[PDB]
Amino acid sequence: SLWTLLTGYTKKESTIGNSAFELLLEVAKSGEKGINTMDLAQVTGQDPRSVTGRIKKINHLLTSSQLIYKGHVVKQLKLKKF
DNA sequence: AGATTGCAGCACCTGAGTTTCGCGTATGGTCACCCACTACACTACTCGGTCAGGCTCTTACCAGCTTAACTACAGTTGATCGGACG
């Protein structure tokens, strides 16, 4: 049901991998504030290459835009509903 | 019409053809980092010219004389020059 409510599909058939789904859960927790890709990377505990390669699987669910943070160039992520 | 026997029907364990799958193994693709090369504008030390300072060499002497040449006066002859010719 959590899978279905967030992705629109059940765990039994959804195309999103477990790691990418946990990324989505972090964006779900942050809601209206959303998460920048580096704080997401730090909180999930994985590197920016891995985060970027995974985020492709969910870019249709997320509104995004560029921003500059701690001298690095990053994007903000928000679920469409927020 | 009974003692001997086969048909074949019931049920349950089993087997392969067929399928879906997981992984190896390996291949094209994302993207993040940091490197090499280039270059417009700059930093800064030296060399170089110019100037003064002031120590330095070398001159040539005054009138006279006494060792040395010129420096004017002077006369018939050049050959460019004017200006007109062909």
Curated annotation (Swiss-Prot):
It is found in: Nucleus; Mitochondrion. Disulfide bonds: none annotated. It comes from the Eukaryota. Present with 125 molecules/cell in log phase SD medium. Component of the TFIIIC complex composed of TFC1, TFC3, TFC4, TFC6, TFC7 and TFC8. The subunits are organized in two globular domains, tauA and tauB, connected by a proteolysis-sensitive and flexible linker. Interacts with TFC1, TFC4 and TFC6. TFIIIC mediates tRNA and 5S RNA gene activation by binding to intragenic promoter elements. Upstream of the transcription start site, TFIIIC assembles the initiation complex TFIIIB-TFIIIC-tDNA, which is sufficient for RNA polymerase III recruitment and function. Part of the tauB domain of TFIIIC that binds boxB DNA promoter sites of tRNA and similar genes. TFC3 is essential for cell viability. Cooperates with TFC6 in DNA binding. This is Transcription factor tau 138 kDa subunit. The chain holds residues 91 to 172 of 1160 of the full protein.
